[PDB]
Amino acid sequence: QPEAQAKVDVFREDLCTKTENLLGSYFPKKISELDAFLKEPALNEANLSNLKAPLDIPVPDPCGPVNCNEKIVVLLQRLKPEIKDVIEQLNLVTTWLQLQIPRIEDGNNFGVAVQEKVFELMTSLHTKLEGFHTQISKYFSERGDAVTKAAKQPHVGDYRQLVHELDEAEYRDIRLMVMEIRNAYAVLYDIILKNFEKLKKPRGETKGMIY
Amino acid sequence: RLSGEARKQVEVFRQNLFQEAEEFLYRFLPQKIIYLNQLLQEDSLNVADLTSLRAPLDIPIPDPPHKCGFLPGNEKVLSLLALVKPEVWTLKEKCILVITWIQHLIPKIEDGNDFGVAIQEKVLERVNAVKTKVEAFQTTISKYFSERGDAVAKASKETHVMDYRALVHERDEAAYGELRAMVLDLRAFYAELYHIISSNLEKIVNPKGEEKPSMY
Amino acid sequence: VRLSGEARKQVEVFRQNLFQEAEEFLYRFLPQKIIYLNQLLQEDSLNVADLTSLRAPLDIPIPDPPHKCGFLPGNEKVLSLLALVKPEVWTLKEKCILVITWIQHLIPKIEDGNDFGVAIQEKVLERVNAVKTKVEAFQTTISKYFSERGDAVAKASKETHVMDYRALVHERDEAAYGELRAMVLDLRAFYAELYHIISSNLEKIVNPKGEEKPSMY
Amino acid sequence: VRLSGEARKQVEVFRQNLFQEAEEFLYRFLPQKIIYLNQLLQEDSLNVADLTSLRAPLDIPIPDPPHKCGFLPGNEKVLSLLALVKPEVWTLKEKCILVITWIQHLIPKIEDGNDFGVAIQEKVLERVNAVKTKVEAFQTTISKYFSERGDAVAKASKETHVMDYRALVHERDEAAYGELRAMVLDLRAFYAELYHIISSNLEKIVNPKGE
Amino acid sequence: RRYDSRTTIFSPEGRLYQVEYAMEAIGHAGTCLGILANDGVLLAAERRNIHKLLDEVFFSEKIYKLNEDMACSVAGITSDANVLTNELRLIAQRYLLQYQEPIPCEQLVTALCDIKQAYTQFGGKRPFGVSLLYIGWDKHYGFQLYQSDPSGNYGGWKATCIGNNSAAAVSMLKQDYKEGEMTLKSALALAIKVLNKTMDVSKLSAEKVEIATLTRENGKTVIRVLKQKEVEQLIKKHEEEEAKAEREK
Amino acid sequence: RGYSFSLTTFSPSGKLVQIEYALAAVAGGAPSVGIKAANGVVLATEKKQKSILYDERSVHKVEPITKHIGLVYSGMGPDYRVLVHRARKLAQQYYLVYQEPIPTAQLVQRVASVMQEYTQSGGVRPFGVSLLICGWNEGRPYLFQSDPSGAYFAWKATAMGKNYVNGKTFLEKRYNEDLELEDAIHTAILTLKESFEGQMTEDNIEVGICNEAGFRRLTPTEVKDYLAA
Amino acid sequence: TGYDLSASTFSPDGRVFQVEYAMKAVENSSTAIGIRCKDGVVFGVEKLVLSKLYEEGSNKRLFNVDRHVGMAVAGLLADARSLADIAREEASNFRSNFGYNIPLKHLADRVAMYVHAYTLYSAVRPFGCSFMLGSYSVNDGAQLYMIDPSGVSYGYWGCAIGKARQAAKTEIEKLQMKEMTCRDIVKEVAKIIYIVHDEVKDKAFELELSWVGELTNGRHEIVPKDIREEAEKYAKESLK
Amino acid sequence: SYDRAITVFSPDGHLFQVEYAQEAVKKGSTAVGVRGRDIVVLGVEKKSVAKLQDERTVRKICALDDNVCMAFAGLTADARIVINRARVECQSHRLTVEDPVTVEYITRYIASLKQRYTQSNGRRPFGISALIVGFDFDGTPRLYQTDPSGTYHAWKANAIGRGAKSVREFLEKNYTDEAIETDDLTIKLVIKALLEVVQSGGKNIELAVMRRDQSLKILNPEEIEKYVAEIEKEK
Amino acid sequence: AGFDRHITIFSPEGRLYQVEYAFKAINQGGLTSVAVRGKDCAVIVTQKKVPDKLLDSSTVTHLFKITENIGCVMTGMTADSRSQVQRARYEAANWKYKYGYEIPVDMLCKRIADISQVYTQNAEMRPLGCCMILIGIDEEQGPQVYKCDPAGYYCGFKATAAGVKQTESTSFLEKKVKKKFDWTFEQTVETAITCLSTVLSIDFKPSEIEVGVVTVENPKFRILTEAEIDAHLVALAER
């Protein structure tokens, strides 16, 4: 039925335009923005003693409400949109590349292999970024469980240290996530730009006419 | 030795599967693609600032040194879930149908002239992959309620810890983002199914091909 | 090995029973089950459109902001549909076991070549083992439903103030209904796929090595 | 894809900064880290001979045969060793990310042949990823020390009758000291191995497809 | 695993898959057609090359004359086709040198088919990826149409088609062809009909087909290619007849 | 798979894929253009040189097989010379046998037969070159193409090499059968002007023409005069 | 990596690795050295005695490829004997056609080209032998040539082949062969071979020597046993 | 593993490509042969007319010489080559020894050719088995069979091709000295045997006879119709 | 892949990667050769590196004489170079025998190059991993410089280089021809030596380089002595 192909071709034309605009403008701009955030003073702090947040838990010889580290929370609040955005753009380009895959044929499988390699790196990036998204979620739960353990056992000293160390680890992980999202944008742009001819046109327009 | 009833029964099942496959491929896929595009255009899926979808939690903050009232779930995300969940189940059903149609089209096993069979297995692994992803999405949908209920119960039990309250809000935010991504990839999956099937349809329906001159 | 006449009789009895039962199953039982599952999914109960029809009351006393929970029944719709489905999944697992054993007894002596027929036998064995694993997954998830719903209602009664557990109980019921209709669809599809593959490749399955050669030896 | 002038400038500055940072890391920072880890290994605290010396005092009342627990602090020695080693760990993870993205940017367009250069590049980045996963495992163990010691101390305080929990706490401290010393040693080893591999294969890494 | 290589290995179930893969190639080729009539025999083919900037310098792109008394049309690889036609012409002229009589049609077909079988059997060379129709008149059996395949197997056909949509062509010819009742004009009309059905182009261009007829006039065979005006008249007549059949309903 | 590497192996779906790869080798070759005018036929190709150090007079991409035949190529330079020597030899054999200049159609048939002869044997590779063979015989112009496959076609005008599809579209837009060669050379240089990615000069292109006189390579001064427009 | 399987192949970085693998063959061999001085060329070989059972004057690695030239080999002895047959055939053909004794440079070139033929083709492996050739003629003078498995040929004032090539080469380097005479050079060749021989790894060796020069009237010949014994005693004395 | 080259033996010493060619023979149309006391009858099934095809071009039964004929089941082109080679050998033997070929001589030659193609790689076995019939100088009927392997065996009666197992079981049951007594009985026996495996009786069998000192006669379709009618009526 | 490892098979992009590897084999040697043409002379220079003192310096050479008036310099595998040199000498002598006059430099290059083509088309043998540069004087055309490569390309040149520093050397020479005023014999030799010394950074001594020249006055190819080479070298340093 040609109407279905017409609608799907409208969708694929929209995808091609969106992906081309993505590579042209959004990926470079986001690389710039993310390195700007990286060089910001907040993300790189000389002493994590400043990063340390107070625990108002009593110490032995019912506790007042303990609070999240505002530093970590603000850094996470600016980070999380970046993770969602990069995952969305990765999904867009992944779908675009999957649509460009040609009809399966015995010959001229080169160009299909190029798409396969680029798809492999896209899959790897997807895995790592989903891991980042999971990490942001589990940080709050781990900190909460640690402070609750501390409240249940005020005498145990190292639970305070567990809370503080979770905060410091999340800070360092946040800056590493910013670095990796930047580098993910860059490597995706580089690979697709270099291989764009085969990615867009795997088989090639050439027809031999041996027949 | 098939009975007439047995042969008629398998024949009608095969024909109904084929007609359902054609109907889905050429009608359902375009309609669902445009419909999911409309959902993505809809403002509910396009919420910009997730502080808006943050829902109030009325657990009493403890005074520095009694029972929490009914604490509701977040209306926005549960409504978005009500929107997306039928579509996910529908896609799983249709991908199962595609798998069955391809498997019925797989021919008698013979050596040689196996390229059509290879095409069939390749499209089969692709549809199985989207089956894996959609059932994973179903599992995420199911786990959201349980994890948020555990989070809010923990926050109530330990009022002093506010990390659990932040966790409840964070779970709501992650659920909204995951739901938007789910709708987006449902559209992508329908389109990819159409693309692979339409592109390789000739070999999928007729793998071995036309009967040969028969050297014998 | 030396075999008594009684031993040979017992083995031949098992063999002939397996062969005749496989023939009867694939020729007669499979079409019957295909149409039975087809009409069952065509049944109105499996095609419930408004899922709020399925959700059942949980009489958990909502906590007023500042006594006990009565017997909380299982969802009648879901348990009735499960009562329908469970015979079918166990039956399919039994029949797939029968098909596995039939093909395995048809596997010939190991030999260096003419292994294309045994390759076909191995491929159909791969498929039947795959559907066997799938039906085992169905069999475990049906129990997972009951255990999970019981835990959910216990949590909801214990923590009345949390409403997410109540929403979870309703969601478990809805997801269970979706899984069940997909399940009956898959059961019918597995019966049909077994029929198709076995019928298509029966010649090489029953006689893998093939007819006797002219014997150049 | 149409390249804006600003977009071209952004991608160019990213590539320039990345390559500059790669050269700087390989030739200036990396030997400085190797000598730093050498002297840190030479420090007396990190080569304590008798591990029973760092056995911490765990003051919980022995139950009288047939009252309350004071504050129990963590082991200052292992905490200080953690304060030393943890920056080095996260630093190596960051530099590993830098090397990975640098290599990936040096990977050329996909072509049918002359692929031994890209094979070498893939081998090197595979080793670098292995180094990164080992480093992440060190981070996991560093996080685990606090939670494990807290669980053990809490269990000993809750169940004072059982002495094996106290012995376990002391064992956790000893194992932590050993693991941290091993971390410093293998951090130095990872830095040196990265230098060796990259310096040995630099010509093909920077220029895989011949000229 | 793979019993499809080297054209000399019988696969299990005893099939030569290289020759089958070669038979797959002819299906891509431009459709060629041949019909046998009481007074003559014709060859009609679809000139698959329809590039605008191509010149019709030759006698015909697909139709070849092998001898005074026969011709052939080829579907498959053009290079192997050229080789086979050269071999055919040499075989015919060798027979004429030896016996001083024209080569019998079946004998020429049999000789080339022996070559094609030989290329299958020996290891190094590939099978000829060609299938071609032979038309000729011989004193023994009169007008004859023959088909050959890459396998080296040939048969005699009253009417047949090779190439793309050959199954559709044969299905149409089965109902339409009247045994013992055809004349060259009716066969030409049938050829135009089946070509219009098979060819994707809605209107047969009359530059997208080449038709040649073999007839015996004054005791000498004449192989003639219908000129563009003649085939234009034929398609006009077919369009008029089909429209009138349409107009009645 | 195995079909990719072998030359005597039909792939599934019946493709001799090594030959398609040789055609891909042709496509990478430099642009070449052929236009058959009413009174002549022009062969043109770019002779872009890596450096000024190259001496243009040393080698030519346009070669005469006979007095009235000449050809140009797109693809592998060594293969071109193997077959240009073989073509000259075949033409001289024809002249010895028949004492007449060989027809262009016959020559292209023979060289295509050679090219086919190479494809069959596994020990050899196909010629990674395609040719445009132009000639004037019987007071008529001729233009032909011969591919690595061993097949030949007759073109009013065509292009090979890089961007051959776009060049062919430009030609079919610009082509008129009534063209004289004075115009046709202009059209040919324009067809190449589509695809240089450089400022064409007398050295960077090589062009030749055939007519009743015979084939000739018009000099650098001549092509400068034609380029001036 | 399938590049190293055949000699027809090239590595992606432009290396024919089968030839290098064949060059590694000779290093398995016991050492052999040849030194050229004013009077003539002296050859020496460290022929390891694998068993007492083997006869003396067997497994000879010093061959006479013509009356005026001698050949010393390291690497596979079968390939070496075959190459010696080839060289003898080349010398005989040269005499038969051109009427005089073959020049050593030309003989080295021809056998080197014969060797180089094998590196190209896939059907046949490179030779597993590296050999030295030496001659003296009053016209040409003293000439020493070495041919590797590749077919590279060069003229050496002093040369070594086999396992201990590098050590033998430094010992030869500190010799000043150009001024010296053959009857001293035999003693120094014995010294170098005794030095490079490893007593621990190699149980025992029998020094095998030859020379060509004016003292022979330009005929390659095995050393007289008295001179062999004198050189061997000198080598044992110097070894300390 | 061991099935890709003709030369290589397998463990347990099976040459499998020749077995695959013997399997290829099974695909072919059925053929049957029977030795009557004074007749040898050779019957072959016909696949289908296709309604636009000329039956004369396709003939499985062929005469090598005046006194010998063969039928084949297997690759048709290979059969054509083998038939031509055996014919030229027949005429060459008559040239060399001034005597007509014996049936065992020609089946030996055909077997030797097939064997020659099996032994060497770079050549594939002829994918045919043949049924050679003739009358020797003494006048005794002779029936021989050949296969791709190159072994040849005399048979009182045999079948080759598809359904050979079934029809030969039928023939083992039916064949006896009584049936061979009459020439018409021999023809009817082979017709019934082919009827055991064929879609339709008269249309799909091509049958021929050789008498003691007469050339091959392909029975007319009317004669075959009469014989099947006589066979059909008796049932 | 597998599209490499055999010369016959084409890549899916039709590139024949094996010959391209043979081109790398030339650079594996670590030596460079330069050839530059002049109005009345043509010169070839190349590095001469003696790995061991024991090697006779006279024997090692990359400059060979194909015939009395043609000289070549080979870069690549020494053995393949010597074999191609022998084939060139045979081709030149056979040309003289058949056609009665000395082979032109262009025809010699063409013969050697088409031989290299038969190597790069037939399966079993491998392309010779060497590059040839031929210099001679033709009466009609004056001096000539030509180069064969493993592929079969044989183009003539005003000036060229081969080896590891080919790109640097041709960049240097391209500038010098662009500022074209002339090249007499001394300036030709100086240009060659300056190109080689600049790209390598060597600052040569007479032993390290071997130079060969042809001139219209003295057509015979001659390999200059160490004294002549030092005479040219000192003149370079003085100015």
Side-chain angles (χ1 to χ4, degrees), chain F residues 4-5 18 21-22 24-25 49 52-55 59 76 78-79 81-82 88 118 122-128, chain I residues 1-3 8-12 14 16 37 110 113-114 117 120-123 146 151-152 154-159 170 177:
Chain F
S4 301
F5 311 106
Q18 269 285 315
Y21 295 171
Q49 293 278 28
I52 177 156
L53 303 189
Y54 287 72
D55 181 17
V59 73
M76 287 186 72
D79 292 332
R81 301 183 308 92
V82 163
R88 287 169 182 182
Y118 268 71
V124 288
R125 61 170 180 78
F127 286 104
Chain I
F3 289 104
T8 66
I9 61 178
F10 275 95
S11 304
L16 295 193
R37 198 169 65 191
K110 193 180 181 164
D114 83 358
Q117 203 274 358
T120 198
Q121 194 172 4
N122 308 131
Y146 276 80
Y154 75 104
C155 195
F157 289 95
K158 297 158 190 172
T170 190
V177 300

Side-chain angles (χ1 to χ4, degrees), chain D residues 13-63 65-66 70-75 77-114 116-125 127-181:
Chain D
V13 296
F14 172 91
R15 192 175 194 82
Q16 170 171 235
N17 294 2
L18 173 48
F19 282 28
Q20 288 169 4
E21 288 166 75
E23 189 202 334
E24 285 189 346
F25 161 73
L26 195 70
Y27 290 100
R28 294 156 184 80
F29 170 90
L30 184 49
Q32 287 168 26
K33 273 288 174 199
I34 285 156
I35 65 173
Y36 169 82
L37 295 170
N38 282 320
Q39 63 179 358
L40 177 58
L41 290 159
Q42 295 311 109
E43 287 181 15
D44 303 329
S45 46
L46 196 50
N47 54 54
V48 163
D50 178 27
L51 272 62
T52 72
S53 76
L54 61 83
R55 189 181 299 272
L58 193 152
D59 184 61
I60 188 78
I62 292 166
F71 184 82
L72 278 70
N75 192 353
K77 295 185 181 72
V78 311
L79 189 135
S80 301
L81 265 71
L82 280 173
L84 283 150
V85 65
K86 184 171 61 50
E88 311 311 289
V89 166
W90 290 94
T91 309
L92 175 51
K93 186 167 178 194
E94 161 167 16
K95 298 303 191 181
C96 285
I97 285 152
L98 183 85
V99 165
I100 292 153
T101 188
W102 172 68
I103 289 159
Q104 283 180 20
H105 275 264
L106 293 164
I107 291 170
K109 187 212 298 190
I110 306 308
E111 302 182 334
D112 178 74
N114 199 11
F116 191 55
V118 304
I120 291 155
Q121 285 174 315
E122 284 167 359
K123 184 67 170 293
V124 176
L125 74 89
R127 187 100 192 80
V128 179
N129 289 332
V131 167
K132 186 173 75 171
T133 197
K134 291 177 189 68
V135 168
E136 286 167 24
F138 305 157
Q139 294 172 5
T140 63
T141 49
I142 289 157
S143 66
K144 276 190 72 169
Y145 153 73
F146 289 99
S147 59
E148 290 287 352
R149 186 190 155 79
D151 294 338
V153 168
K155 288 156 66 65
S157 305
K158 178 66 188 74
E159 311 293 354
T160 187
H161 59 92
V162 51
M163 307 300 293
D164 210 304
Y165 290 160
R166 306 183 189 181
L168 178 59
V169 169
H170 300 125
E171 184 182 357
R172 294 307 192 186
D173 295 355
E174 288 194 351
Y177 168 78
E179 287 163 17
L180 271 50
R181 185 176 182 278

Side-chain angles (χ1 to χ4, degrees), chain G residues 101-126:
Chain G
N101 294 17
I102 192 164
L104 191 71
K105 190 259 283 193
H106 194 236
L107 175 53
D109 293 4
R110 300 303 301 283
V111 301
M113 288 293 103
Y114 187 79
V115 165
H116 164 259
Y118 291 92
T119 179
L120 305 188
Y121 304 103
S122 46
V124 191
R125 61 175 170 78

Side-chain angles (χ1 to χ4, degrees), chain B residues 35-62 64-65 69 71-74 76-113 115-130:
Chain B
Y35 164 75
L36 296 159
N37 186 16
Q38 292 150 41
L39 289 181
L40 290 154
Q41 290 296 329
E42 194 191 326
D43 72 309
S44 181
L45 280 72
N46 203 37
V47 163
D49 190 3
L50 282 79
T51 57
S52 70
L53 60 84
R54 192 188 301 267
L57 183 49
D58 66 83
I59 295 161
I61 192 69
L71 314 168
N74 178 16
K76 295 195 200 60
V77 298
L78 60 87
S79 65
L80 193 61
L81 202 78
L83 282 155
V84 59
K85 188 195 291 169
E87 288 296 313
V88 174
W89 286 105
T90 309
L91 174 45
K92 195 166 80 73
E93 188 168 35
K94 295 299 188 289
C95 82
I96 286 155
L97 188 147
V98 165
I99 288 153
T100 320
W101 170 68
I102 295 154
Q103 284 178 4
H104 276 259
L105 291 165
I106 289 169
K108 184 192 188 179
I109 297 152
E110 61 182 34
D111 55 300
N113 293 117
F115 200 74
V117 181
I119 287 158
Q120 283 174 328
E121 307 301 7
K122 191 161 177 187
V123 303
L124 205 72
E125 71 159 32
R126 181 68 62 82
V127 303
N128 291 329
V130 307

Side-chain angles (χ1 to χ4, degrees), chain H residues 78-119 121-128 130-137 139-148 150-164 166-168 170-171 174-175 179 185-187 189-191 193-195 198 201-202 204-205 207-210:
Chain H
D78 291 3
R80 197 175 62 252
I81 301 303
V82 168
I83 287 155
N84 178 67
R85 293 284 294 280
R87 281 157 168 174
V88 60
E89 180 54 46
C90 287
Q91 298 295 343
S92 181
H93 173 266
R94 285 170 64 175
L95 194 52
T96 303
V97 295
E98 201 75 39
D99 284 327
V101 169
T102 309
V103 193
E104 197 181 344
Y105 177 85
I106 195 66
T107 195
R108 283 161 70 265
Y109 171 74
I110 289 153
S112 73
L113 180 58
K114 294 180 188 185
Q115 192 277 328
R116 189 172 307 106
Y117 277 67
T118 52
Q119 63 183 356
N121 206 335
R123 304 198 295 280
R124 58 173 184 81
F126 288 102
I128 57 167
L131 285 155
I132 298 97
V133 300
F135 279 105
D136 77 323
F137 188 86
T140 54
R142 307 281 191 178
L143 171 62
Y144 288 92
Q145 192 273 330
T146 62
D147 62 354
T151 193
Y152 70 92
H153 290 118
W155 288 84
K156 295 167 199 80
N158 196 34
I160 63 173
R162 66 196 200 74
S166 173
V167 68
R168 79 171 56 193
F170 164 90
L171 197 149
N174 284 58
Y175 182 88
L185 282 176
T186 58
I187 295 151
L189 173 51
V190 60
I191 289 161
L194 283 159
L195 281 157
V198 72
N204 306 343
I205 68 187
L207 188 142
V209 306
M210 186 189 287

Side-chain angles (χ1 to χ4, degrees), chain A residues 20 155 157-159 190 194-195, chain D residues 1 72 105 107 110 149-150:
Chain A
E20 284 169 316
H155 50 93
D158 54 20
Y159 287 143
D190 183 88
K194 286 175 171 172
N195 303 328
Chain D
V1 58
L72 278 70
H105 275 264
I107 291 170
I110 306 308
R149 186 190 155 79

Side-chain angles (χ1 to χ4, degrees), chain I residues 103-138 141-148:
Chain I
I103 189 162
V105 171
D106 62 274
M107 290 285 104
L108 181 60
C109 202
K110 193 180 181 164
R111 183 72 267 174
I112 288 283
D114 83 358
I115 291 154
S116 314
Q117 203 274 358
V118 306
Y119 275 67
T120 198
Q121 194 172 4
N122 308 131
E124 66 277 17
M125 60 193 167
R126 65 167 170 81
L128 273 55
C130 55
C131 178
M132 179 182 281
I133 315 186
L134 293 154
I135 50 151
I137 309 301
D138 178 40
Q141 310 281 355
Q144 307 202 274
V145 187
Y146 276 80
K147 183 204 277 174
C148 282

Side-chain angles (χ1 to χ4, degrees), chain I residues 50-51 53-67 69-90 92-101 103-138 141-173:
Chain I
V50 285
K53 76 187 70 51
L54 301 171
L55 268 162
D56 193 342
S57 49
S58 316
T59 311
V60 62
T61 188
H62 299 88
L63 268 58
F64 315 90
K65 184 179 285 191
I66 310 312
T67 193
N69 295 16
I70 307 176
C72 71
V73 59
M74 302 298 289
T75 318
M77 305 201 188
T78 310
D80 301 10
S81 288
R82 297 261 171 78
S83 65
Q84 202 169 101
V85 167
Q86 286 297 120
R87 180 57 159 281
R89 285 158 165 173
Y90 163 78
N94 182 67
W95 182 287
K96 183 65 169 62
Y97 181 75
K98 289 158 70 186
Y99 310 115
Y101 71 110
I103 189 162
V105 171
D106 62 274
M107 290 285 104
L108 181 60
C109 202
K110 193 180 181 164
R111 183 72 267 174
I112 288 283
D114 83 358
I115 291 154
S116 314
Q117 203 274 358
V118 306
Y119 275 67
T120 198
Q121 194 172 4
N122 308 131
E124 66 277 17
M125 60 193 167
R126 65 167 170 81
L128 273 55
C130 55
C131 178
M132 179 182 281
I133 315 186
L134 293 154
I135 50 151
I137 309 301
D138 178 40
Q141 310 281 355
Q144 307 202 274
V145 187
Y146 276 80
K147 183 204 277 174
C148 282
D149 57 2
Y153 192 67
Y154 75 104
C155 195
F157 289 95
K158 297 158 190 172
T160 317
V164 305
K165 303 306 201 290
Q166 174 169 6
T167 185
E168 299 177 13
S169 178
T170 190
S171 78
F172 177 90
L173 300 158

